[PDB]
Design a binder for this molecule. Structure first.
Ligand SMILES: [Mg+2]
Ligand SMILES: [Mg+2]
Ligand SMILES: [Mg+2]
Ligand SMILES: [Mg+2]
Ligand SMILES: [Mg+2]
Ligand SMILES: [Mg+2]
Ligand SMILES: [Mg+2]
Ligand SMILES: [Mg+2]
Ligand SMILES: [Mg+2]
Ligand SMILES: [Mg+2]
Ligand SMILES: [Mg+2]
Ligand SMILES: [Mg+2]
Ligand SMILES: [Mg+2]
Ligand SMILES: [Mg+2]
Ligand SMILES: [Mg+2]
Ligand SMILES: [Mg+2]
Ligand SMILES: [Mg+2]
Ligand SMILES: [Mg+2]
Ligand SMILES: [Mg+2]
Ligand SMILES: [Mg+2]
Ligand SMILES: [Mg+2]
Ligand SMILES: [Mg+2]
Ligand SMILES: [Mg+2]
Ligand SMILES: [Mg+2]
Ligand SMILES: [Mg+2]
Ligand SMILES: [Mg+2]
Ligand SMILES: [Mg+2]
Ligand SMILES: [Mg+2]
Ligand SMILES: [Mg+2]
Ligand SMILES: [Mg+2]
Ligand SMILES: [Mg+2]
Ligand SMILES: [Mg+2]
Ligand SMILES: [Mg+2]
Ligand SMILES: [Mg+2]
Ligand SMILES: [Mg+2]
Ligand SMILES: [Mg+2]
Ligand SMILES: [Mg+2]
Ligand SMILES: [Mg+2]
Ligand SMILES: [Mg+2]
Ligand SMILES: [Mg+2]
Ligand SMILES: [Mg+2]
Ligand SMILES: [Mg+2]
Ligand SMILES: [Mg+2]
Ligand SMILES: [Mg+2]
Ligand SMILES: [Mg+2]
Ligand SMILES: [Mg+2]
Ligand SMILES: [Mg+2]
Ligand SMILES: [Mg+2]
Ligand SMILES: [Mg+2]
Ligand SMILES: [Mg+2]
Ligand SMILES: [Mg+2]
Ligand SMILES: [Mg+2]
Ligand SMILES: [Mg+2]
Ligand SMILES: [Mg+2]
Ligand SMILES: [Mg+2]
Ligand SMILES: [Mg+2]
Ligand SMILES: [Mg+2]
Ligand SMILES: [Mg+2]
Ligand SMILES: [Mg+2]
Ligand SMILES: [Mg+2]
Ligand SMILES: [Mg+2]
Ligand SMILES: [Mg+2]
Ligand SMILES: [Mg+2]
Ligand SMILES: [Mg+2]
Ligand SMILES: [Mg+2]
Ligand SMILES: [Mg+2]
Ligand SMILES: [Mg+2]
Ligand SMILES: [Mg+2]
Ligand SMILES: [Mg+2]
Ligand SMILES: [Mg+2]
Ligand SMILES: [Mg+2]
Ligand SMILES: [Mg+2]
Ligand SMILES: [Mg+2]
Ligand SMILES: [Mg+2]
Ligand SMILES: [Mg+2]
Ligand SMILES: [Mg+2]
Ligand SMILES: [Mg+2]
Ligand SMILES: [Mg+2]
Ligand SMILES: [Mg+2]
Ligand SMILES: [Mg+2]
Ligand SMILES: [Mg+2]
Ligand SMILES: [Mg+2]
Ligand SMILES: [Mg+2]
Ligand SMILES: [Mg+2]
Ligand SMILES: [Mg+2]
Ligand SMILES: [Mg+2]
Ligand SMILES: [Mg+2]
Ligand SMILES: [Mg+2]
Ligand SMILES: [Mg+2]
Ligand SMILES: [Mg+2]
Ligand SMILES: [Mg+2]
Ligand SMILES: [Mg+2]
Length: 245
RNA sequence: GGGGCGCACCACCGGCCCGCCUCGCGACCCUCCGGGGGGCAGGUGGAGUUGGAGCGCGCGCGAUGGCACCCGAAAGAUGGUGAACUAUGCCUGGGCAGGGCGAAGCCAGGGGAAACUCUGGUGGAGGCCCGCCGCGGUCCUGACGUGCAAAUCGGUCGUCCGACCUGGGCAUAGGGGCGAAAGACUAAUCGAACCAUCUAGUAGCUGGUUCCCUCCGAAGUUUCCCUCAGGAUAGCUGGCGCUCGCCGAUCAAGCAGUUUUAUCCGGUAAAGCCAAUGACUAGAGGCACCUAUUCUCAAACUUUAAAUGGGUAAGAGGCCCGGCUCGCUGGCGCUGGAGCCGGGCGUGGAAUGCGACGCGCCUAGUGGGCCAUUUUUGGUA
RNA sequence: AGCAGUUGAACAUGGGUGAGCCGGUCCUAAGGGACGGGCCUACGCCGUUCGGAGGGGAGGGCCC
RNA sequence: GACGCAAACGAACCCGGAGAUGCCGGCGGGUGCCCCGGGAAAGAGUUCUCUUUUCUUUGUGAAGGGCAGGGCGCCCUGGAACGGGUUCGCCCCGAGAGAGGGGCCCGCGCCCUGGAAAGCGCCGCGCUUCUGGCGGCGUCCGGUGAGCUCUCGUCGGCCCUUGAAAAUCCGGGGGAGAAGGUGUAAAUCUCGCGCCGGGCCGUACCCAUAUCCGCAGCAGGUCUCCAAGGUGAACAGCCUCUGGCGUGUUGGAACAAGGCAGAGUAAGGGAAGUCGGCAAGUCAGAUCCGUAACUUCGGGAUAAGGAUUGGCUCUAAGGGCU
RNA sequence: UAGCAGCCAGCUUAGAACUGUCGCGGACCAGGGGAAUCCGACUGUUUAAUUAAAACAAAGCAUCGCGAAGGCCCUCGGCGGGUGUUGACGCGAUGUGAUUUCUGCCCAGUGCUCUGAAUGUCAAAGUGAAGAAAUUCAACGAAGCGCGGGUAAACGGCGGGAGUAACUAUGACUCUCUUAAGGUAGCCAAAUGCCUCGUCAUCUAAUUAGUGACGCGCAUGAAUGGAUGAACGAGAUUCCCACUGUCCCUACCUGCUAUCUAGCGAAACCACAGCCAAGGGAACGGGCUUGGCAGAAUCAGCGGGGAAAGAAGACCCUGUUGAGCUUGACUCUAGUCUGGCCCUGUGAAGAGACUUUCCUCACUUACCCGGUGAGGCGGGCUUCUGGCGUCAAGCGCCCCGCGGGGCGCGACCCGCCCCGGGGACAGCGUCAGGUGGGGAGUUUGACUGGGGCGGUACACCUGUCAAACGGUAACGCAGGUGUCCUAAGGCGAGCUCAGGGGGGACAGAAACCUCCCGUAGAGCAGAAGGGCAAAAGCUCGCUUGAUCUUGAUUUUCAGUAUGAGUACGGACCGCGAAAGCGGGGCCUCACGAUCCUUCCGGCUUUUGGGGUUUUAAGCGGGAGGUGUCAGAAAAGUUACCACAGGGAUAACUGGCUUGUGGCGGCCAAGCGUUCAUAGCGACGUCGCUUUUUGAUCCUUCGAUGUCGGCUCUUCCUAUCAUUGUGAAGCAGAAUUCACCAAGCGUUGGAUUGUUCACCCACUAACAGGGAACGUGAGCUGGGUUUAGACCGUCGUGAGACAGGUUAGUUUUACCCUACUGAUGUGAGCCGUUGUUGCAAUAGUAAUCCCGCUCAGUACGAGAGGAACCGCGGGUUCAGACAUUUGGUUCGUGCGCUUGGCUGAGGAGCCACUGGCGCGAAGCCACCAUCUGC
């Protein structure tokens, strides 16, 4: 047979991202002496819509401490901020919405967003619209903390990872039901070439391990092992259980 | 008319060499420690030996390896070239009459005790409707069907503000691409493109295989084979000879799809079942059986038993006589037996026919058969 | 030039395209593709704003 | 005061603007085209009868100066409820309406320089390869429109769609520096004008029922711009003017059969034809009435089912300006 | 002041009068409608060149993986690349397919997944012991497998049999079997129901259709989604209204062709060619045989034939030919998981032995990741606002000409890595084990009354077939075998069996004792045949001839091997007093090459430059086995299919055959009230026919187009009707049987694709067939019979269905005959030319019914009820014809009229015939009329 549609997505020919009209990479300010021993003042200039995601981005303009220049940072717009307000990033920053203070200096039960996995990566966890991570507990002995990622998994990260307080804007976006296939067409036309998903049973055995047969049955257990080769690993990969639940 | 040496060659019997087995176990001069021999004889295996025949070259033919008598596959592999068509994505541009229903919002007038309602107008929403260009291609299964056209033409028809149509520039390249998924599309080529090469790929399979005359002349059957459209093998065929007889039974002869004479073999036709095994009808006698009878049968039953047919014997390789040899045999140097040697005896001791279809070598084709008289199996035929 | 022709996109002999202000040239879009580095036995390939001691213009008379 | 004056020094560095933003809808300003009124001028057409008739032609470039017109969450005064202003729709106001007076932007419209000398229209004379030249007159006065396009604005609508980069150019912040000491100097965003230069390549023609592709002068295929009068809702169909053409690789004479097509027509019956109402036949625009079962209350729906429609002569209603 | 005057400007709406032939969206433009069923929600998309659909997509719903050292995926490769300018409201992988309403039971099987070294199996490396060593042995022992748990919106699955309620019936209720659960809610003869044209109702004069119901449903059923559904559809289906040449039943007109002509001018095709009947033949000739017969050269048609052209059949079989694809095929592989070694160093703690192994925690410098313009690391001064922040003001000190310059503090000092996060773990290199249709290569026996399924007739044995030597075939017949036996082998001795009769306590038809008869009629391991009585059977006691060896030889045979046998020679033995017998079974069957492994044997060989010892090799003989049995290591599918071929071989016709089907006789038990034969014919039996279906496989696979209908012609008779007759259980009428006889006619419809059926009416009757199951270059494609798709059942799957359902290119004649018409042709010319005729021969045509009268008569008890002659019409058919009626009308004849055009009137034109009304002439219709012996 030939290669399945899933194998062709790794080549990156027509399945690359559509990043022409995107406004940049949303990431926190790189950690420097100002964010380690104090705080830096920044002004929110504009809240723009990034084509491809459901969460707005804020263009916060800080002041460079070593040269006469004003840096522009493209943050994740936490729900509640507005243009013209001041955002303070650093250790000594107060516990307000929008500020970027390390998780080690936050009380237990804080709602953060754009959390950092490791110190310096400029914000990875809890970055989609309406999502957040809660700080569960601290540990001054091992300099570690425990946060609750939006997937429900409790991850143990360092106490120096910075995060934006407050939930991400654009919450409740998945509540409005898409009514037309055209709204789903324009939804993915800005993300990537992945929308029309042809079922494996609707294909021939050459293109998919589920195709073929005078009926449209699967014919084999859809639950597939994890060590299955690329080309066979379709359906339910390493399914611990199935059913309605 | 008699005798003899006998070529080549054939049949048979011996000698010797090598392997192996068995019996002799060892006295004896080859031993210098170690050792080597000890006619060993009797069977047996060998592509041996007992007075070489090979080598070289040339020619003919046959079976092989090779492109291999010529033309032909569907495929496989290596290396390249294509997204001017088409599929999807990206960048940047262009384009889509005229009408219809008419949503939120708003204004006004009425009803209310509040909750809130009713009428008109406004507004111009929509993968909304009729519909032109566009873009598609339903039906007539129309036209055309060596056409205008290697897919077109006419009427009709789908859609036409959205998942729309479209140009250019870019991206993905062959077991790869791409696919709102038809195994579709990827330059008229796609259930794996095109170009060149390996490649004159292989074919037990179709087709063809070129001058004349003379002579001989088949096989579709046996055995083995992942064989049953093919091979191997035997048979049938041809060629080259060769050993003789040629002289006729001057000669030995021998042979025969034939008879005669003589002697054996068989269990089919017929016959039998009142004889056995098995099947079977009917009375009668004696106290369901029992006896003597009776009707009807056998391919896997038979007492008996043909016709046709099969084998063998019809002479010198015989017949007869004498002597000798033996470890075999044993009352019995002959007790058998067999071998060896010598001598005596043609009226070649049935008919007919014929040179021996004698001794070898090489060998093509064939290995699908079909029909008839009689015999006969399966089948209604 | 599927009949013809005194005709032609045929044949023969000559002639014809003039730019500071039309466009190319210039810019980067998708994208292609060097450099550093890595990789490949190799021809070469991967990768593209990241990565090398990657700065050869500007100013004050020798500084930056 | 918005901001205006011909100019009106200024580095490093910084900040910002323009380049540079979608689709759709409504409205308004301006051109082009069309139309109407001159009982307008110059030629032509018609005249059998009528026709002060019918047809054609009546002009201004870029750039600059001025002025209409359009736009503005631009300024000052002032202060709002009996709330007012205002659009087709909206929208606006104590974070300051209405009103009064100003500022700026766009002006592709009009006047002027250009510029009538030229261009068209008409008339006359000279001339027949210098001839293939010289003269005369005219180029006018208004109107609007649910008209059609283009364009500039403006207010909205839609998105789980937010609808490009860079060269290049400009403004501001910044005040490092430079200029002369009593008439000039530094510096000038020409600030009025003058001087010099602008190389290289493409440029003809066809652009499709005969210059491209499909073996061809192939009923196929191939990206765009301009686009008139009448009927009509229409860029539909039919007819006409500008422009183009000879009927699409041939003429002539016949009008048999049989075909293709005209979606030709038909007595009485009306699907009895046929696998099957295949085929084509009925219906069709618009106005006024009237519209069920069912339903997700959106629809069904142009449901179904009726009436009216020409021509001509009138009447009534719907405007603007002084 | 309930506003007026003047002037200007268009374009619409409403009402009314009048008027033309009731014509007016007048041309043009331009929805037929209604009641329901099936499927898909809708818009969209799709097989460029046969399938536009119910298929794909879709929103909605649900499951699955993954927190970045990650999920998914790419690359030969860089810890390179895609999702990712991403971060669970995200990305990746699947099923379902809107909304409404629901989504039941089963975790045994397969698959996924979790648990765990707490017990089996378990590689490389390492560790231990023996040994000169190679080597052998033992312990240890990862993932995976095994054990256990979970999971079905994972693949999937979801049963049988009796009794029983006051007639009958049903079986609530019980009984039994049985699982892993035994189909729940629903729905249905459904696109799913073989039987089947189910049954009832409805729809029609009539319905295999449609719809509503019924449900033990071959084989419905719940996200392999069930039920329903407004709107929507170039989807499938039924009925109704309107409409119409679809039809009854065809006719007429027009344009472009065909036709003729000037010019121009091909191609497919072609063995030679072209009249038929029959015969034979390779079983359907054009040519051959026997007959019919046969006259130049051509035009327009035509579709009977040339088993016409197009194309080495696509179906079928064969090939030791392929390809696509799928798995539980065979053999491998990328990837992935796992362990040892490696870069890999350092410090410490604990527990088993005496420098150490296991595990854990730490060190940073190897290694790895992240951040930045490597901007403040380690050790002793900004939170009230959508301002501003740029190379230092100041102080100290120094150097030059009031003008310049430089330095330090401001801006603390020291340092070893830029700062963080891991860290000798990730990772890399290399072996090892597991997983691995993701991918690669290949295989997937043969025989065979086609192949497949079945069978083994594939290696063997008995009787028969087999025709009296031997041999002799078929998917001939009746059978048997892949074993059994330390005795059932060998030998010696003794004994006599099967059965029957007479007897004998319990004891009987069967126990045991005994006498008599007993040719074997018993037994001999098995199938059968043969053989056997002091045996070969039975019993008993001694035994290992069931051993070791060379050759000869029989049988299958090629006269090869193996297997199975026979007779001897040489050893060593058994039994017997002995002669003798015995190297397996009473005989015919019971079995296996090369290579390799293994064991036994040597009075032995090599291990090579010698010697010694291990090891290995070799010679001789067994065993391990190839049952496809002279011996490959091997699962499917293909309807997406390809190639080489095959009429060696199936599906059509034809041919032979006629079981079967159909049809007709013979005999006469009996039926017929009585009477065998008016009409029938049981038990038997003899034939015909090729309109049934088989059997066969001769023709055809470098192709004979294939089911039905439509259309049209002709023949046959085994006669339904009509004509002429015979017979009766013929009174009449009606009907039945039979004869001469195919001249003539044999219908319109509902349902079904149907031939075949069934019903509705009509009728003199509505007979049965043939002609390549007549007839596709005649048509129609409904059916079947490619590719799309749906369901049911089956398969793990790809896929299958002789089951259902929907959409699916029907090509060419101009050649030669045949036929239909149209010119012309004997040419030999005193013949040329014309008129009027004759006639061979060929075709041939009429058919049937009704009404009146006979007649209410014959006849009959009645009820009922004819016929001939004559008269008047009609059905079907045939040949004509246009006076009349009707159709057509581009005499474009006349009138009218829509839009536009010529300035208007008048007169006209344009819109491929603008439209409408009427319409001459022609042509035309059982739609008018006339004739038919
Ligand atoms: Mg499919
Ligand atoms: Mg499948
Ligand atoms: Mg499905
Ligand atoms: Mg299944
Ligand atoms: Mg191969
Ligand atoms: Mg656009
Ligand atoms: Mg509608
Ligand atoms: Mg259209
Ligand atoms: Mg298409
Ligand atoms: Mg078409
Ligand atoms: Mg057609
Ligand atoms: Mg034709
Ligand atoms: Mg394009
Ligand atoms: Mg690749
Ligand atoms: Mg598509
Ligand atoms: Mg398919
Ligand atoms: Mg496609
Ligand atoms: Mg002799
Ligand atoms: Mg053979
Ligand atoms: Mg041979
Ligand atoms: Mg010519
Ligand atoms: Mg010329
Ligand atoms: Mg030329
Ligand atoms: Mg732009
Ligand atoms: Mg733009
Ligand atoms: Mg606008
Ligand atoms: Mg104001
Ligand atoms: Mg400035
Ligand atoms: Mg030009
Ligand atoms: Mg032309
Ligand atoms: Mg005609
Ligand atoms: Mg016609
Ligand atoms: Mg009619
Ligand atoms: Mg009919
Ligand atoms: Mg009908
Ligand atoms: Mg139709
Ligand atoms: Mg309706
Ligand atoms: Mg239903
Ligand atoms: Mg239906
Ligand atoms: Mg649909
Ligand atoms: Mg198609
Ligand atoms: Mg699922
Ligand atoms: Mg579906
Ligand atoms: Mg379920
Ligand atoms: Mg399970
Ligand atoms: Mg030693
Ligand atoms: Mg049920
Ligand atoms: Mg019907
Ligand atoms: Mg029903
Ligand atoms: Mg079921
Ligand atoms: Mg089921
Ligand atoms: Mg189902
Ligand atoms: Mg519609
Ligand atoms: Mg449709
Ligand atoms: Mg429909
Ligand atoms: Mg549609
Ligand atoms: Mg012939
Ligand atoms: Mg043919
Ligand atoms: Mg062939
Ligand atoms: Mg073979
Ligand atoms: Mg293939
Ligand atoms: Mg495979
Ligand atoms: Mg293969
Ligand atoms: Mg076979
Ligand atoms: Mg055989
Ligand atoms: Mg057997
Ligand atoms: Mg014989
Ligand atoms: Mg012996
Ligand atoms: Mg017969
Ligand atoms: Mg019969
Ligand atoms: Mg009787
Ligand atoms: Mg009789
Ligand atoms: Mg009978
Ligand atoms: Mg029949
Ligand atoms: Mg045959
Ligand atoms: Mg007769
Ligand atoms: Mg009779
Ligand atoms: Mg027949
Ligand atoms: Mg036929
Ligand atoms: Mg045909
Ligand atoms: Mg037919
Ligand atoms: Mg025919
Ligand atoms: Mg069909
Ligand atoms: Mg059918
Ligand atoms: Mg099909
Ligand atoms: Mg079927
Ligand atoms: Mg009477
Ligand atoms: Mg008439
Ligand atoms: Mg008119
Ligand atoms: Mg026209
Ligand atoms: Mg017309
Ligand atoms: Mg008329």
């Amino acid at each position: 047979g030939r290669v399945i549609r899933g194998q062709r997505k790794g080549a990156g020919s027509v399945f690359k991202a559509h990043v022409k009209h995107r406004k940049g990479a949303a990431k926190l300010r790189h950690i420097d002496f100002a964010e380690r021993h104090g705080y830096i003042k920044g002004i929110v200039k504009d809240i723009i819509h990034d084509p491809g995601r459901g969460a707005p981005l804020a263009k916060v303009m800080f002041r460079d401490p070593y040269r006469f220049k004003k840096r522009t940072e493209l943050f994740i717009a936490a729900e509640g901020i507005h243009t013209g307000q001041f955002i303070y990033c650093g250790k000594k920053a107060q516990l307000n919405i929008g500020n970027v203070l390390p998780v080690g200096t936050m009380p237990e039960g804080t709602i953060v967003c754009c959390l950092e996995e490791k110190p310096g990566d400029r914000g990875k966890l809890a970055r989609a619209s309406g999502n957040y991570a809660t700080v569960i507990s601290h540990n001054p002995e091992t300099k570690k903390s425990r946060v609750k990622l939006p997937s429900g998994s409790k991850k143990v990260i360092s106490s120096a990872n910075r995060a934006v307080v407050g939930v991400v804007a654009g919450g409740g976006r998945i509540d409005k039901p898409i009514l037309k296939a055209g709204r789903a067409y324009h939804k993915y036309k800005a993300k990537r070439n992945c929308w029309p998903r042809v079922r494996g049973v609707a294909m021939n055995p050459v293109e998919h391990p589920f195709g073929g047969g005078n009926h449209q049955h699967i014919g084999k257990p859809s639950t597939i092992r994890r060590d299955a080769p690329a080309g066979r690993k379709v359906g339910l990969i390493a399914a611990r259980r199935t059913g309605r639940l």
